[PDB]
Amino acid sequence: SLLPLSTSLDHRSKEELHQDCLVLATAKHSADVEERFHLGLFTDRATLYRMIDIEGKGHLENGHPELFHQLMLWKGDLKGVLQTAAERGELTDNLVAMAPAAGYHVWLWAVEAFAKQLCFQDQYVKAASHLLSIHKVYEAVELLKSNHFYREAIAIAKARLRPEDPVLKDLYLSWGTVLERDGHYAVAAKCYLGATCAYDAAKVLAKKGDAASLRTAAELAAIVGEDELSASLALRCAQELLLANNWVGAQEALQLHESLQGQRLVFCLLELLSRHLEEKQLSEGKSSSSYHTWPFVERVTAVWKSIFSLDTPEQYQEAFQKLQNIKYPSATNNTPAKQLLLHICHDLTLAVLSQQMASWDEAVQALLRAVVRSYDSGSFTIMQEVYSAFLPDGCDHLRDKLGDHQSPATPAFKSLEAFFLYGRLYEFWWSLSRPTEEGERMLSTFKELFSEKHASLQNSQRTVAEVQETLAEMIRQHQSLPELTKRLTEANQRMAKFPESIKAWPFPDVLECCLVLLLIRSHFPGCLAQEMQQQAQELLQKYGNT
């Protein structure tokens, strides 16, 4: 198998095996031996060497370089064999294993040469293993790292290098950066943990945005310290867990850091209100609403006393102070229907809380802030049921406590009562349509809703916001005028003359409240609405043409 050409040649016919012997006989006792190279096994070294490198060329021109190198070993030029195979890149486990015959340094050169060759054949782990035998750990780690064999690079670095070697620490960070790039956040968190940088591990887990990922990042943060980070992470998990109406999942995430104690009350009020809402909307419902098993205002106070131990007024203040600091954005018209309700419930929570510690002034301000938020977002039905839940009877039972010119917060009381009548008037309107029992007695109570000062001021803010759109239109088109400045003076100077109270507290659109009353009035002939119809008519003319 290793000398195949001569093996067949000496198996020829006896015709050519007889001239073969006589050529051999003559040689011992010379161009006739040239043709018969197979007689090298019997004559001398020189003809045997010529014999061996004719089986060489023939192990190459057959596709068996492994046999060619084995033949070259017999001649005794092992050092020269490796260099030849190095140039043409046919080094193998067999060749390197025979390398130390020439010498140790020949083996040293052979493995590095074999390592370089194995790289070009996409054999990187094997190449790195050979580099380890040369006692080149840093080169082996660098070679694997540069080819994104991070798992194998770490294993060799972990086993061979010290745990605190900067080479090892960088491997985790380098691998974590790659894994984080393509959405493998969970594993990339472990790489940062291995890199003894725990803070970055929690944040990477948070970057997923998933509810479970948010929770585990919060728990992971708490283990390594990072208490202020854990609270922020747990809160975000709870906010995401109400997006699926998981009211038991949401409240457990708030049990992590115990600085969320203030936010626990909000999610309790948010849950009970949402139960109060979906109940009297479709008279029944089960929409994966995972409720707990625990007068609306007294119903949340009772639950707060039991489920959260909020009985004595000592910690009413701490809950109030911990909650009054947090502010939310302006809550524009477009906003998720679940986050918007949470923002309202935060202001509602302060309202009931202030009601507990006889803080009537802040109670109306917190209530007003909750109503306004809902009104500003256009969610009229939510604004209406807030009054139903928190002011079930009316609004006069708060006037005696503070509204009798007792505190400077009664301007805020007027806004809250004005918004209450706004819903009452709208309701009275839809009652006239398909979806008199209300009685005219109640109709002559919206008189406070028709405030000329609030009507004029909302008219002034209309032109000013309009003026800032006529000019902003013209400068936009660039890429009546003299009176336009004058009309600002008619308004921008006018609303400056009002008391600071008028501009401090919002009001319902008096012009809109004047449309509905006239519009409602169009169903009942022979009413005349006393002076109320005329006053609404007069107000419409004065601020409606503009």
Numbering used by the authors: 847 to 875, 884 to 1148, 1155 to 1295, 1346 to 1389, 1430 to 1496
The publication says:
Gemin5 in the Survival Motor Neuron (SMN) complex serves as the RNA-binding protein to deliver small nuclear RNAs (snRNAs) to the small nuclear ribonucleoprotein Sm complex via its N-terminal WD40 domain. Additionally, the C-terminal region plays an important role in regulating RNA translation by directly binding to viral RNAs and cellular mRNAs. Here, we present the three-dimensional structure of the Gemin5 C-terminal region, which adopts a homodecamer architecture comprised of a dimer of pentamers. By structural analysis, mutagenesis, and RNA-binding assays, we find that the intact pentamer/decamer is critical for the Gemin5 C-terminal region to bind cognate RNA ligands and to regulate mRNA translation.
Symmetry expansion and focused refinement for the G5C protomer generated an overall map of 2.6 Å resolution. Consistent with the result from the SLS experiment, G5C forms a homodecamer with an MW of ~750 kDa. For each protomer, 531 out of 663 residues were unambiguously built, with several unresolved loop regions in the structure due to intrinsic flexibility. The G5C protomer is composed of 32 α-helices arranged in three regions. The N-terminal region of G5C consists of α1–α18, with α18 packing against α17 of the solved TPR domain (α1–α17) to form an extra TPR module. The middle region is composed of α19–α25. α22–α24 constitute a helix bundle, with α22 and α24 packing against α19–α21. The loop between α19 and α20 (aa 1133–1154) is invisible in the structure. α25 extends from α24 and connects the middle region to the C-terminal region. The C-terminal region consists of α26–α32 containing two helix bundles, α28–α29 and α26–α27–α31–α32. α30 is a short helix packing with α26, α28, and α29. The loops between α26 and α27 (aa 1294–1345) and between α28 and α29 (aa 1392–1429), as well as the last 12 C-terminal residues (aa 1497–1508), are invisible in the structure.
